Amino acid sequence: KGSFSNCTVRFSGQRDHDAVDEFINAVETYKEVEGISDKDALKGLPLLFKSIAVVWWKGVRRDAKTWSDALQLLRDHFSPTKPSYQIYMEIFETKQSYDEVIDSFICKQRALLAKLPEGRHDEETELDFIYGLMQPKYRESIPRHEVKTFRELLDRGRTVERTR
Amino acid sequence: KGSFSNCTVRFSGQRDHDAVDEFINAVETYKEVEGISDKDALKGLPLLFKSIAVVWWKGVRRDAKTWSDALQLLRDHFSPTKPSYQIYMEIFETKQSYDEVIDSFICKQRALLAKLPEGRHDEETELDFIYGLMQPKYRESIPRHEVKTFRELLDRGRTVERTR
Amino acid sequence: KGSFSNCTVRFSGQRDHDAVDEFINAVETYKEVEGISDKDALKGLPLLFKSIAVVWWKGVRRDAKTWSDALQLLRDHFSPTKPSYQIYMEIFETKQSYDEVIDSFICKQRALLAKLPEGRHDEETELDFIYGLMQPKYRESIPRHEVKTFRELLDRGRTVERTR
Amino acid sequence: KGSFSNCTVRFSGQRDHDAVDEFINAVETYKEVEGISDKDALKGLPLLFKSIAVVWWKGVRRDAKTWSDALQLLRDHFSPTKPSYQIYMEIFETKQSYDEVIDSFICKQRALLAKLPEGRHDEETELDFIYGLMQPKYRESIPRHEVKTFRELLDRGRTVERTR
Amino acid sequence: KGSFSNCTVRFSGQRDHDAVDEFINAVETYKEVEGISDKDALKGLPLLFKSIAVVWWKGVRRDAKTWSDALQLLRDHFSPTKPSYQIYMEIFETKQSYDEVIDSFICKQRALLAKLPEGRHDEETELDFIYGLMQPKYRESIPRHEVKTFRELLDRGRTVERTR
Amino acid sequence: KGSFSNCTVRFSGQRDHDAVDEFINAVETYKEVEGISDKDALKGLPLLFKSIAVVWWKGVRRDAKTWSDALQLLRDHFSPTKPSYQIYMEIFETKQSYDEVIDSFICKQRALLAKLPEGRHDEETELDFIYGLMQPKYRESIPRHEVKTFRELLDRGRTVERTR
Secondary structure (H helix, E strand, O other): OOOOOOOOOOEOOOOOHHHHHHHHHHHHHHHHHHOOOHHHHHHOHHHOEOOOHHHHHOOOHHHOOOHHHHHHHHHHHHOOOOOHHHHHHHHOOOOOOOOOOHHHHHHHHHHHHOOOOOOOOOHHHHHHHHHHHOOHHHHOOOOOOOOOOOHHHHHHHHHHHHHO | OOOOOOOOOOEOOOOOHHHHHHHHHHHHHHHHHHOOOOOHHHHOHHHOEOOHHHHHHHHOOOOOOOHHHHHHHHHHHHOOOOOHHHHHHHOOOOOOOOOOOHHHHHHHHHHHHOOOOOOOOOHHHHHHHHHHHOOHHHHOOOOOOOOOOHHHHHHHHHHHHHHO | OOOOOOOOOOOOOOOOHHHHHHHHHHHHHHHHHHOOOOOOOOOOHHHOOOOOHHHHHOOOHHHOOOHHHHHHHHHHHHOOOOOHHHHHHHHOOOOOOOOOOHHHHHHHHHHHHOOOOOOOOOHHHHHHHHHHHOOOOOOOOOOOOOOOOOHHHHHHHHHHHHHO | OOOOOOOOOOOOOOOOHHHHHHHHHHHHHHHHHHOOOOOOOOOOHHHOOOOOHHHHHOOOHHHOOOHHHHHHHHHHHHOOOOOHHHHHHHHOOOOOOOOOOHHHHHHHHHHHHOOOOOOOOOHHHHHHHHHHOOOOOOOOOOOOOOOOOOHHHHHHHHHHHHHO | OOOOOOOOOOEOOOOOHHHHHHHHHHHHHHHHHHOOOOOHHHHOHHHOEOOHHHHHHHHOOOOOOOHHHHHHHHHHHHOOOOOHHHHHHHOOOOOOOOOOOHHHHHHHHHHHHOOOOOOOOOHHHHHHHHHHHOOHHHHOOOOOOOOOOHHHHHHHHHHHHHHO | OOOOOOOOOOEOOOOOHHHHHHHHHHHHHHHHHHOOOHHHHHHOHHHOEOOOHHHHHOOOHHHOOOHHHHHHHHHHHHOOOOOHHHHHHHHOOOOOOOOOOHHHHHHHHHHHHOOOOOOOOOHHHHHHHHHHOOOHHHHOOOOOOOOOOOHHHHHHHHHHHHHO
């Protein structure tokens, strides 16, 4: 049988979204695939933490009752869920420099801008910003109001990438 | 049995056709073999991403709900179905170098020629380009109009290769 | 069947409080997780001691007849089980220094305070000591009686940390 | 359930007879050991090809409808399935050199001879070729018609090897 | 369940008392825990030997048939029950060095004194020797005739150690 | 379930008794603990060999029918089972040199002399040979006919080892 003896991955607490999301997703899919009940899951929790997360868990052990709130607390204390104005300040900080590919740039900008509350920004508003911030090497060939959707910007960008 | 715990293949976002096609082939074969349900396959999908493509998947999580739409969304950004004139200029940008076997050559040529729109070329036209493009080790013993079907070219090539 | 085959957590007698406390905690959680019965755990005890301590278990084996007395003996012979007065004279012992993240300080304070007997200190009393101990980079803009819940201290400290 | 999840033996197309023969042998023994049925093995075939060959399987997939024809195609496209006459003109090709252990020579000769069709050569016929190719450090004291069984050659060769 | 497949502990043949006693203790505890039959334990015994002791076990395989006789044969050659005058000359060849805790000292002294014939020393005779052996950090505050039982010496030592 | 997919140890064929004995013992205890039948065991045999043992097995595959003869052949071809006169020549070759312990010497001599046919040599002949093969540093203090059994030689040797 076995229940939370060890795992392939463990936790370290390094103040990053990707590591804690990978850890919590691997823990959830292991709990789903093994068949462990919810009552057995919380009691076998302190075998996972090894770094200074375990002296964090030594403090707030009595604060949690069920598996849901105890899993919610791990997202609350280590992932900051930043407010609005810092994210809005962050997008207008770094202009696109030279010798950088357009695709990774728009990829990083979309991953940065996806953290806002949903329903505030459709594809028209999002589409204004990338064209507005590109170098003059891109802005000469493609104008605004030609690229309606979001795929067409990358589509006309790759052709000017090819010729260069 | 199984709910997509962990497997061998992984993705990087290299922007080549071969790795992206191999990844989709391996995942779509494993899903049909192991017997994983259609809804349950999507919840285990960000366990495979490891790289710049995690930044990609974080931006378009709200776009796809069905597994087929997520598969087409994975195909659309990386392997973009480049137009015809790039392929036609690419099939003539490389001749056959010496001491190279005919099998890997005809495999790469068919894999590069299969990107065209289907129904635009018969069997005879493809057979013409392959005979003309080969090294003069083969053209002096294999003349045109002997072979018609695409298998007899390899059949008459491997004998001359074995004879050396 | 199967009880106490092997694991990573082994004990060696290094005369420090942290290592013996982590060992006793890990064994005590493993006993409740795996379901090992009380009377059967005493037989499989020297599979863990592979150190100088296996010489020690040959000397004082006959003093223990139950699992609780054996655990208390293993605590008593190696760890002096520090009382409350040294904890209270050790909490105010050190202050907060410059350029230190507030989360590490709060985690250290709660981890050092959770060893007290449970039920003697509610939430209002614990907060005052941490507020008093805080660095005057934090105490100028965050006064007492504005915070009630323990989360409010971290939530108002992160803004002053970001403001710089 | 479960059929062809993963293993160490993977195929890459390295154009050498030894690697493809070891791969076909290992897959053929795994099929009989694990109990994978005949019709179900064709679906789980491209989980092994993670190389240039996964491009090759997209080209010629429709030529195979059974497992035997697929195995023959995988043999035919990469390995020229050497006939008997090259084996007989390659066995006498090399002799025995000085300071060589007799066991390695007999193992090489039997491994190179076992690829012949079974039932055409009994035990008396094989002995003649090995005896003829023996290094005259061995042929002076061990003449023909003293040995009958194949073990007698090694058993009388080890004494002359030890005598030095 | 289990028929002695593989475990953690292993033997080397170091010719010290502690490692040889720890090995026999671990094996005799594992045999009683896992439920391995008396005859079946001997057939899996040369899987544990790794060293010069394999050369030892190859010589005396025909000597033992029962597990108890094989255990005594393993005890007889390595830990040879050295005579009394070596132990009596050894218990006085080492005084107590400074900054050394009393627990490891009394543990090593009892483990070295337990090699004597039992029934040759009462409880009173051991205590005087331990008192004579100790550093003058302890003798000035703990005088003779205060302690009688062997536990009260450690009880009156740990308080002076905590006071420092 | 599983049956001979892989193992912890595999085979290499390095002309040594200890390696092939360890391999054959691990294979036998794995077959006993897993519950594999005898018919399934021979068919799953060629997954183990990786070195030049596999081209040895490619020759003699048809020579074996059952598991017993196929396991007997592995001891026959790789372990030489030396005859009498070479073993009798080997024991009188190397005299005991200086600064060498008596115990490892008599251990190596017993492991060498145990390979003879059983019943030819009791304990009286062996003691005389051991007395005969030692330096004058040992022969002065202990004479023949004082040490009746075999333990007493080591017993009186360790005392002259101690004083030296």
